[PDB]
Structure 1
């Protein structure tokens, strides 16, 4: 019974969490000051997105030194004090591990690029131009364009699956794996409690490097032939030595692989995120296109991941939000009239699944997309570039702004709204990204003083996971699969059940318990609800707009 199984993790994006220095950028001291808040929310893990030394060409995911902290966030002494104060409050700390690639400003790369005969050359993935002048493969970077960048001085291309200054490490090379493990030991011995492993499932490449005539080439590196071998080796060398938690962030992976990644017998990872439920509103897999989410598909994806991982002995990391996705109230809830109720409903819908839940900073306040209506308010380079291109293509300003409001990666990066003071109390200076005007109504101080707040609903869900074992051990059973508005399911235990009923829309609808649900001899009590208007009988009743109810059934 490992500590991570009943944990709730709070995801912090430090640059937007809390500025204590006045430069408008969040810092580690700001995190320390907020530990009591995190503890009050009843999270027992904190996860920091990358804070390592980095040129910042790619939001910190381009690391030039894994052993030091980007100066703006604070000092190593600050970090060590964060670990000490977190641990004092019973809070564990996990870091972001980004080892598929490094910055091309990393010393290994600078050495490696300098000549084909340099000691570090094989730390990266180098290939010759094809005789026909083509790049070594037709693979595409996830940033667009070719995944190979030519280096004139040495006469070869290096592989970058991501941005140009993010060079893929050569995991075929034992020296590299060894270096990475040494670095992980450094952080564990400092006392951190685990890692999120960034796109870890793309580290094994097909060493034949064939062309892809059926896609962009991801089938030659996604969940590749040695990934499970590398993860298990990583587990033997590192993770097995500490009381650790590891969560792998898998890029377009499959359920069968994730079962293998997370089954305790594999000795690979503890849990994984997948992103399938967060592609439910992409029409034709077009990531920037507007569309309504496909509810039935959403329910099918969630259910499949619950039942198959449960069956296979895998473990899911449960989440709606991160620094790259729209805030969920705005995306799948109603950030208008039903902001509070729909935010509570969304939290319940996911937290009553089997898995380890993750809360993204500000999600517990029901923070919304900021709805910035002028390009001068945006920051992310992909947003600025998309605006520039759509403008040149003649799209009216208002239509471009509507796209950015739905899709900009800036949207979940606005500063956490602490209070009703200037810039919501995030900073005394000028924030690196603006705070939208809702902050006067949406902020921690307000939520903390409202017993009916989204915050306290999350706190209660968090404590429930510690109080009721069935949340962890019960199976999952989808019901009302084809219902156009309700997401309802059971968690089945030993003479004990949870019945979870969520209205995903703002209309009234009928719930009726299916005949094949056997609850003879079971007594019902409300475990948690977002509405005091409770049905006389849960077996058939009219569900209110965005109503969410969980019943504890015991025999």
Structure 2
């Protein structure tokens, strides 16, 4: 059984983790200083978002040199000391791998853009104007507008699925692939334990580059004709030579493809993230619009991914949070009265699923969205732009602010709140982004000194995954599918079950075990609960607001 199957991963966004230098920006030395904290949480993998040399046009996802570290974050010596101090504590480290595109400041692009005959020209994707003066395709960039950028000096457009200074690498080019693999070897040989592969399912483009009527063009590069081939090749050349863990981040993918990506027979990736459960509060798929989450759809989404991947032999990365997503307690939980209870409930809801769980820095503290009530507190360029545009269109100030409070991509980027000192102890300087005033009540020092804290609830969930094999091997069975408040399910094992019951809302409601649930001869014991008010009988009882209970049933 691979070491990653029962692992729990702690996601670190270094800019906002811990500043040890006083410049207001988190750094690698800060992570080192926190390894004992991460071990205390009982995570055994650390995942760092991009720390590579980069102009920082796109939050580090525009990489100008894969072999060195952004100076702000520290030195390569720091990094190697982090690998060494981590491994000594039994913690593995995986890196973020961004190889769909490079910065246009990368050596290869500067060379390639110089002319149609430069050696590196075909490292990127170039096409001519259409006769009608239109771009090569009508495909849209995910940052909006055309996915093609004209390069005057050479007379062609290069492709960018993402931002303008993020030029898509040409994966049809075997030369490019080999260079990527060499780069991957460099890091593995340095001693990292794996990679999360950023938007990896878009590297295979339809080489006929046709126009998209019915859409924005994503139909022509998402889970494309050669993605499985490329990943498997990457497996043979790189992943197969190390004791590694690889997780792919998928854009707009499908269950069928994710089964192929992660079934061990494919020799592609170990697991994948998909984001469908994090779109359950998008009205009509509009990412910036306000709405309450659709609970039944959420349950349906989680259950499909559980049962289908289980049947297909695939593996899910399990998570609620990212540097790009709202903090989960504010989003699907209650960040007021029931902040602690609902944070624990959400943690249990997803950790008791089949797969490998990911904790985003500060989630274990129940950090909330910061509720910044003024435009000067925000940093994310997309938020600043959105405020500018909505202001120009005459939306009132308070209404724009409400939108940013729910949707700004800064929301989970505020500094980790360590203690109740200045700037929550994140920095002795001025943080690059403000700390909200809740820090005095919400911080690690306070959580670590409260036996009933969210932090220790996560610790227990993390250790349970090591202690109870059914969390890894049990199937998944949804019950109470139509219930408007309860998310409940079973994990069925060999004369052993888990029954997990989560109230997703702040009202009392009844749980009754369905008649088809055959538990004859099983004894029940509480595995973990966020409430000491335990039912006389789990078979029928009144669930308290945001109550979360897991029963361990055995013969």
Check whether TM > 0.5.
yes
CA offset digits 1:444-493 (Å, max 9, x no partner): 00000000000000000000000000000000000000000000000000
Distance, in Å, in 1 between the alignment partners of 2:320 and 2:249 is 14
Shift of 1:221: 0.1
2:396 aligns with 396
1:69 paired to 2:108: no
1:324 deviates by: 0.1
**SS of the residue aligned with 2:116?**
coil
User: Shift in Å at residue 531 of structure 1?
Assistant: 0.1
The within-5 A match list for 1:477-492 is 477-492=477-492
Deviation, structure 1 residue 394: 0.5
Structure 1 residues 65-99: Cα deviation after superposition (integer angstroms, max 9, x where no partner): 00000000000000000000000000000000000
Could you give the per-residue CA deviations for residues 36-55 of structure 1, whole angstroms, max 9, x where no partner exists? 00000000000000000000
The Cα shift of 1:376 comes to 0.3
- Per the TM alignment, residue 242 of structure 1 is displaced from its structure 2 partner at its CA by 0.1
> How large is the Cα RMSD of the aligned pairs?
0.2
Q: Aligned partners of 1:391, 1:313: CA distance in 2, in Å?
A: 50
Q: TM-score, normalised by structure 2?
A: 1.00
Corresponding residue SS for 2:549: strand
Q: Deviations over 1:487-519 (max 9, x none)?
A: 000000000000000000000000000000000
1:364 Cα shift?
Answer: 0.1
Please give the alpha-carbon distance, in whole angstroms, between the structure 2 residues aligned to 1:538 and 1:115: 71
What is the CA distance between 1:413 and its match in structure 2? 0.1
User: What do the CA deviations read for 1:328-377 (whole angstroms, capped 9, x no partner)?
Assistant: 00000000000000000000000000000000000000000000000000
Match of 1:460 in 2: 460
Q: What pairs with 1:219-234 in structure 2 (closer than 5 Å)? A: 219-234=219-234
Cα offset, 1:181, TM superposition? 0.2
User: What CA distance in whole angstroms lies between the structure 2 residues aligned with 1:392 and 1:537?
Assistant: 59
Provide structure 1 residue ranges, at least 5 long, that are not aligned to the other structure.
none
Distance 1:546 1:369 in 2: 19
Question: 1:216 Cα deviation (Å)?
Answer: 0.1
TM-score (norm 1): 1.00
Deviation at 1:383, TM superposition (A): 0.3
Q: List alignment gaps of at least 5 residues for structure 2.
A: none
The alpha-carbon deviation at position 391 of structure 1 amounts to: 0.4
Secondary structure (helix, strand or coil) at the match of 2:386 reads: helix
**In structure 1, the residue corresponding to 2:358 is in which secondary structure?**
strand
Rounded to whole Å, the distance in 1 between the matches of 2:495 and 2:286 is 46
How far 1:542 moved relative to its partner?
A: 0.1
Q: Which residue of 1 aligns with 2:303?
A: 303
Matched residues in 2 for 1:475 and 1:145: separation?
A: 44
Runs of 4+ displaced beyond 4 Å: none
Matches of 1:500 and 1:527, distance apart in 2: 10
**Cα shift at 1:554:** 0.1
Q: How many residues align?
A: 555
Q: CA deviation at 1:100?
A: 0.0
SS in 2 for 1:4: coil
Q: What is the Cα deviation at residue 548 of structure 1?
A: 0.1
Match of 1:432 in 2: 432
Equivalents in 2 of 1:283, 1:179: separation in Å? Answer: 42
CA deviation after TM superposition for structure 1 residue 208, in Å:
0.1
Secondary structure at the residue paired with 1:5? Answer: coil
